[PDB]
């Protein structure tokens, strides 16, 4: 989650 947005699809 720290480098790539976990709230994208």
């Amino acid at each position, epitope marked *: 989650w*720290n*480098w*790539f947005d976990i*709230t994208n699809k």
Partner: antibody
Amino acid sequence: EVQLLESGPGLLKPSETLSLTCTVSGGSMINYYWSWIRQPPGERPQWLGHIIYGGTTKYNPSLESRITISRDISKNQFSLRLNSVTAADTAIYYCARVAIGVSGFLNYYYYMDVWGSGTAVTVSS
Amino acid sequence: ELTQSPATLSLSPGERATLSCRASQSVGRNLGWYQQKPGQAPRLLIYDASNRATGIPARFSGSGSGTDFTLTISSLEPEDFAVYYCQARLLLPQTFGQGTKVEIKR
């Protein structure tokens, strides 16, 4: 106790630029996301956007054109810039910690678990 | 989006408060409840449907999954008369529901 404190000037006129900073104390910035929320008088809170430890941002599409969020890990802070304000940008602005994590296969949880104190922003001629 | 009902609950200190939040599309157990006292920031109350946030009084509980969620206050205290909001994930345009206000009945 992790503590967030909003700072920055709150009185603007229309066409001007809002600039706020959140300072995080008592905890690290890694493994949480970092959001700006605002709440106009008598309305529910509105999520403005967030930034992740890595620097990637995500914004509320109704502000996309005018908003920027940034973070400085060395200084334990993150910031909001909102361009071209109108009277409609009048609200109490909050910085908030977001507890995030995996829930399902391609699902997540998102909770604003630590709130700052709020700063009253007025935009008016 | 999230639909909270009713808008206002009028109850006595001591009684049980039951608050509803319905999500239009399913959100699993990933819904949160927040409490807001006048002139204070909102605070986290319940997360993942049923988990008391750190420090939240045992009188606060949460249930449901998917579509229908409930916040229960077993026995109201003076300090619990406030506005309660639900929120699930990062749904837009409205990430938070409209709020339910729990007022003192007299």
